[PDB]
Design a protein around this ligand. Structure first.
Ligand SMILES: N[C@@H](CCC(=O)N[C@@H](CS(=O)(=O)O)C(=O)NCC(=O)O)C(=O)O
Ligand SMILES: N[C@@H](CCC(=O)N[C@@H](CS(=O)(=O)O)C(=O)NCC(=O)O)C(=O)O
Lengths: 212, 212
């Protein structure tokens, strides 16, 4: 069994999936696209026209990163990325909710800042910034002084925490997350040494087409 | 056991939760707010500053509608809103992914249309519209000629399909979904007669504060 994954170089949503595939020992081909350019092939698979898209070997696709991760956990349960118990499942998923919500607000911010300056909405930017900073502070609070986000070993919660912090350094660089949250700095440094992370570090892509 | 739910009258995300609580026979108090006004209390509970927020009786909260639904399924498994088998779980969740993605694009459209006309982005509007119409067409395709979205009985898939269609009639009224997708029209008519739906129909709220 092998997969193909439509991905973009900065994409945190795709990074979660890339990390999960590697952690589960599932081979895959990375199919890099700019999903904001008219050349993207995402609409052929995802009615929502977003990546990541997991392309299945016998045909069809799975989209929406959190859903792809649930799909992978059911199809390939070993090694697990979630704890076996419901409380642990829910704890890991809460980190993922926060990661995703922060990332959504970062993307909305990025595209607001692509508008002509005169047309940028200060209240919309401020609204999204409260989500970014407040969501991040909550991830840091939940981690506290512990070695792992959930329990005693690597889980989805660590995928989420490491992904969002790595993404902020690319697409919300003004926020000194390492200084405000040294616990996240230390966790990030541990996680970024894992091969799954080291093979998926974000960088900024080039967007050519007009989006806004 | 009883809950309080911070909700807004049009909110499809909150509607899914309101339907689920009622279908599971879980009493709750509806706490209606406009989450776009400065009076909202959502930030006291959700770092992402969104509703729905499920307020727990002994303290704390759960946010993000899909996560709230997963939480409810674990805490209150009977009666179930998901099939017992993994294929059925994944099928129901795919409808929820589509519902949520359509709703996200509707909200972005609504707020773009609140901008001064000269500042509205035609390409951004067009991008979101492809998600709305294409996502809806996929829900209709998946339902096909069957009585229920998933298997032989009411599930989360029906919550998703009925919620998104009811919401489009309020916040994307130009789209004649009943005419293009008579299967969804018929399903909607069945679902809207259920007490859980009939007690949660969306209507437009008043937004006073500037959002964009
Ligand atoms: N909720 C989705 C979000 C995915 C998403 O927004 N992807 C972006 C790319 S990236 O920001 O991750 O770089 C996309 O394809 N956007 C295209 C669009 O929204 O039209 C998920 O979790 O997969
Ligand atoms: N993904 C969230 C979306 C929730 C959401 O966007 N809620 C809106 C209200 S509504 O559109 O449902 O009416 C909100 O609180 N928005 C406030 C904000 O984004 O600042 C979920 O599924 O709960």
């Amino acid at each position: 069994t092998r997969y193909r994954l439509i991905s973009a170089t900065p994409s945190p949503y795709a990074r979660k999936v890339r990390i999960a595939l590697a952690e589960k020992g599932l081979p895959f081909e990375l199919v890099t696209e700019v999903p904001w350019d008219s050349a993207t092939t995402v609409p052929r698979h995802n009615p929502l026209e977003k990546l990541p898209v997991l392309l299945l070997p016998a045909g069809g696709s799975v989209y929406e990163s959190s859903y792809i991760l649930q799909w992978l956990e059911l199809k390939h349960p070993d090694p697990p990325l979630l704890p076996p118990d419901p409380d642990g499942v829910l704890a890991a998923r809460r980190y993922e909710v926060l990661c995703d919500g922060i990332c959504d607000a970062v993307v909305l911010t990025f595209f607001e800042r692509q508008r002509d300056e005169a047309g940028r909405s200060a209240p919309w930017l401020a609204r999204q910034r409260r989500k970014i900073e407040g969501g991040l502070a909550e991830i840091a609070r939940l981690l506290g002084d512990r070695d792992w986000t959930v329990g005693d070993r690597f889980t989805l919660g660590d995928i989420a925490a490491g992904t969002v912090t790595g993404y902020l350094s690319v697409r919300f660089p003004e926020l000194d997350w390492r200084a405000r949250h040294p616990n996240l700095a230390r966790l990030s440094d541990r996680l970024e040494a894992r091969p799954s992370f080291a093979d998926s570090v974000p960088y900024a892509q080039t967007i050519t087409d007009r989006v806004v």
